[PDB]
Each structure stands twice: as C-alpha cells, then as structure tokens.
Amino acid sequence: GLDAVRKRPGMYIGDTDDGTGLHHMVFEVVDNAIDEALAGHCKEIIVTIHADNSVSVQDDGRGIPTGIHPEEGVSAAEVIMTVLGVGVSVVNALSQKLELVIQREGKIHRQIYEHGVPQAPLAVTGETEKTGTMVRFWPSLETFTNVTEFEYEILAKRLRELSFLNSGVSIRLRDKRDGKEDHFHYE
Numbered sequence: 001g002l003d004a005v006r007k008r009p010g011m012y013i014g015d016t017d018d019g020t021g022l023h024h025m026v027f028e029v030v031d032n033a034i035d036e037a038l039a040g041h042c043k044e045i046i047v048t049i050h051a052d053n054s055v056s057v058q059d060d061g062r063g064i065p066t067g068i069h070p071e072e073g074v075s076a077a078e079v080i081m082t083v084l085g086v087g088v089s090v091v092n093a094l095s096q097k098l099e100l101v102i103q104r105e106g107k108i109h110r111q112i113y114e115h116g117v118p119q120a121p122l123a124v125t126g127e128t129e130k131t132g133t134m135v136r137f138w139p140s141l142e143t144f145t146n147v148t149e150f151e152y153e154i155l156a157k158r159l160r161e162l163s164f165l166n167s168g169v170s171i172r173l174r175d176k177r178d179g180k181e182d183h184f185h186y187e
C-alpha cells in the first residue's frame with residue numbers, strides 16, 4: 001500500500017523533479033482542512049514554511065478522530081494516515097517524517113510516522129481548551145529531486161485561490177525562513 005506509493009510516486013502526487021508534486025503535498029493536506037471548513041467546523045487555516053525543510057498545516061476544526069478500535073488496538077487517526085484528491089496517506093508515504101497533533105475533547109494527541117510507518121501508537125501529550133488538527137511533514141529526499149524546498153509564491157498563489165473558492169475561510173501563510181506572512185480571506 002504505502003510501498004506502492006513510494007515505488008511510483010509521480011503516479012500519485014505528480015512530477016517529483018520540478019516542484020509540482022512537492023507542492024501538491026502541501027495542497028493535499030490543506031484540502032483536508034478546507035473540507036473541515038466546508039463542513040462548517042473550521043474557520044482558520046495556518047500554513048507555515050519552517051526553516052528545517054518541513055511545512056505545517058494547522059486548522060481549528062473538530063480534530064481528526066482519536067478513538068481506538070478495541071479489538072485491533074489501532075486508532076482512527078492512524079487508519080486515516082495510513083490507508084489509501086489523492087489523500088493525506090499519500091503525503092505520509094512520501095514524507096521521511098510526518099507529525100500529527102490533534103486537539104480534541106480536552107486532550108492533545110500525537111503520532112509520528114516515517115515514510116508512512118507509525119513509530120509508536122497515537123498518544124496523549126497534554127490537555128487543551130482548543131480543537132484542531134496539525135500536520136507537519138518533511139518530504140522524502142529519496143522521492144523529490146531538483147526542487148526539494150517549499151517556495152512561497154507557489155503556496156501563496158494557490159492558498160489565495162482556495163480562500164476565494166471557499167468564501168469565509170481565513171488562510172494564513174507564514175514563512176519562518178524570512179518572516180514573510182500573508183492573510184487570505186474573502187467576503
């Protein structure tokens with residue numbers, strides 16, 4: 001499953017050699033937050049370009065479900081992150097590392113994956129008065145070539161579009177490599 005994506009990544013994410021697929025990785029994650037907005041449960045989305053070759057997408061929605069199937073011991077979160085709009089599990093497969101943090105029902109939940117493989121079970125890491133989902137990922141440098149860093153203008157163009165196609169949703173874009181920030185929202 002995850003191995004299929006890792007073997008023929010271009011097929012799932014787009015061209016791995018010119019930045020297209022690299023940025024589609026971000027947009028797949030953003031589309032999940034947009035869907036939570038369209039369901040009427042997320043008002044703000046924050047996309048952050050970190051200085052360590054990762055991007056985070058944060059929303060203030062209900063949170064990815066965190067319950068466990070008692071016979072299987074696997075959380076819903078993990079199912080969502082690992083099982084095959086190409087889906088966040090593709091992004092996971094093609095990240096050297098992905099971190100998931102969910103704020104839901106008063107608790108913070110966290111799980112780490114490498115190349116889509118969960119490193120330990122979803123675990124409680126604190127309490128919180130907020131809700132939402134944060135996905136931070138570091139793209140696989142075995143998959144992506146030539147353009148391996150995120151480029152502000154590509155994200156800015158598409159995030160602006162996503163904000164005007166989903167009117168009422170606030171999308172912030174923050175770049176920690178230079179302090180650049182934008183706020184996209186349409187009425």
Ligand SMILES: CCNC(=O)Nc1cc(-n2cccn2)c(C(=O)Nc2cccnc2)cn1
Pocket residue numbers: 029030032033036057058059061062063064065080133134135
């Ligand atoms: C940064 C990326 N953001 C992101 O993935 N956001 C996201 C995703 C959700 N889900 C998507 C599939 C399953 N849940 C849900 C979701 O549907 N949560 C949910 C809905 C109903 C009951 N319990 C939990 C909420 N937010």
